[PDB]
């Protein structure tokens, strides 16, 4: 009976691993995307004000 428990537990562990990987990739790309966007906005506004 416990052999089936072995197999099934390994099953859910294996099918949940890639979801965790994908979520990590999405998070750590979105953070840098937001940071870069904010920095670019600040630079553009500052340059526009300096010229004006």
């Amino acid at each position: 009976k416990k052999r089936q428990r072995m197999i099934e537990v390994q099953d859910e562990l294996l099918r949940l691993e890639p979801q965790l990987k994908q979520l990590q990739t999405k998070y750590d790309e979105l953070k840098e995307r937001k940071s870069s966007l904010r920095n670019a906005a600040y630079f553009l506004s500052n340059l526009k004000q300096l010229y004006q």
Binding site: S36, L37, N39, A40, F43, L44, N46, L47, K48, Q49, L50, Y51
Partner: protein, 224 residues
Amino acid sequence: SKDLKNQLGHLESELSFLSTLTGINIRNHSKQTEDLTSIRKVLQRHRLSGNCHMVTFQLEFQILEIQNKERLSSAVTDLNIIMEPTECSELSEFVSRAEERKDLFMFFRSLHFFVEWFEYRKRTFKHLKEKYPDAVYLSEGPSSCSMGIRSASRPGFELVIVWRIQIDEDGKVFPKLDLLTKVPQRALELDKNRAIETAPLSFRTLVGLLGIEAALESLIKSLC
């Protein structure tokens, strides 16, 4: 004689299709054969000219086919290519590198990529030349690497965009963008925020955020 004309027309159409698909139009080709037998060694000299849509070339090489009982080794013993004398020094540098490396296919592929990037650069510069003719000053022309943005209200304040195309040692081709600002110190003494020294890195981040032409038009609008 209609069938022969039909075959000639079909071959001409196929040749044109292959030339416009690959992107290489070849000129006449000449072949010479020499037998140097001691196990057999044959030296074949080929010469051909051609062009890629923008640039002509003339190449001549010789290969040594070594036919044996079980192996047929072919090695490019010598190659020599000639360009037209353009102003692209890196083109000559890569020609020398390919000459001293004695390889052919990478040369063709790199030339294709180079002319591809060159055509995008020219088409991008010429479009922005006409889109905002009152704020753009293409000093050297669309077939160059420089772009000059300037305001007609004051000729003192203007900056330049440098777009370069570089070929690494391996043979790949990559572009690069930068800006150089000719700003008087009057702006430095006016603004204490000091937002001009960080222009290069910030601009390169900007162009990697929303595109190339988008950043260029944003800069044009801000300078307007």
